[PDB]
From Swiss-Prot, chains A, B:
Recorded superkingdom: Eukaryota
Function: Regulates G protein-coupled receptor signaling cascades. Inhibits signal transduction by increasing the GTPase activity of G protein alpha subunits, thereby driving them into their inactive GDP-bound form. The RGS6/GNB5 dimer enhances GNAO1 GTPase activity.
UniProt organism field: Homo sapiens (Human)
Free-text note on domains in this protein's UniProt record: The RGS domain interacts avidly with Galpha and mediates the acceleration of Galpha-mediated GTP hydrolysis.
Predominant subcellular localization, coarse grouping: cytoplasm
Protein keywords: Cell membrane, Cytoplasm, GTPase activation, Membrane, Nucleus, Signal transduction inhibitor
SUBUNIT field: Interacts with GNB5. Interacts with RGS7BP, leading to regulate the subcellular location of the heterodimer formed with GNB5. Interacts with GNAI1.
Compartments it resides in: Cytoplasm; Cytoplasm, Cytosol; Membrane; Nucleus
The protein, known as: Regulator of G-protein signaling 6
RGS domain: residues covered: 13-118
GO biological process, one term: regulation of G protein-coupled receptor signaling pathway
GO MF terms, alphabetically ordered: GTPase activator activity; GTPase activity
GO cellular component entries: cytoplasm; cytosol; membrane; neuron projection; nucleus; plasma membrane
Length: 129, 129
């Protein structure tokens, strides 16, 4: 069995249960009797995602979405609409907007600092007849 | 050659140059004489990223970072510190925080709605002796 000292520590804070795998397994059996175990399994799945090699992330994200959030998901969780929409966008985006702010800065830089100069260039003006 | 009508359209707005591949190539040759072509190549690289199959994104992101932003990058661009730090975090994160808001909502849900109930459970209390 586990000691009284650690069994007591689980009742100190929720974080203490999450940190101790035996307390967490006990909590999980409780959630199963509550029919709310999908919450812990999702949380655990997302923690595991953070530890994944880069090359495995995209697949794991899709698996988490399909398991917990997609239409017809076998372990549907309930989110506030805000975090659902953000999550759905992140999953759909799939890393493709990693350089959004950077690209916007550079777009503005070219527009303000290079574009008007081009138009004044002989390179350009020589084309205009 | 290109017509006067389209050559003129390039001077209508910067977006018109970016849309027309012949105007864009002309702009690029100008940037090369300005030694600022890395700005356009970065912008173009990021546009191409948005069109990539999911399985290719992670690699392409690392290639863009290495080409334009990493220490010792062959085509160094200059960003404001803010977009640099955001970009660097996005690249490092690598999709692993796709479920950040969702996980936080579920963490709070378990803490508020399930945790205290567990502690009151016979499941738990039976362990305490």
């Amino acid at each position: 069995m586990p000691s009284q000292q650690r069994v007591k520590r689980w009742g100190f804070s929720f974080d203490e249960i999450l940190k101790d795998q035996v307390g967490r397994d006990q909590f999980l059996r409780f959630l199963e009797s509550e029919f709310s175990s999908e919450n812990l399994r999702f949380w655990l799945a997302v923690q595991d995602l953070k530890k994944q090699p880069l090359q495995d992330v995209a697949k794991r994200v899709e698996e988490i979405w399909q398991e917990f959030l997609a239409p017809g998901a076998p372990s549907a969780i309930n989110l506030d609409s805000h975090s659902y929409e953000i999550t759905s966008q992140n999953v759909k985006d799939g890393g493709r907007y990693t350089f959004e702010d950077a690209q916007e800065h550079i777009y503005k830089l070219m527009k303000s600092d290079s574009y008007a100069r081009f138009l004044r260039s002989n390179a350009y003006q020589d084309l205009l007849l």
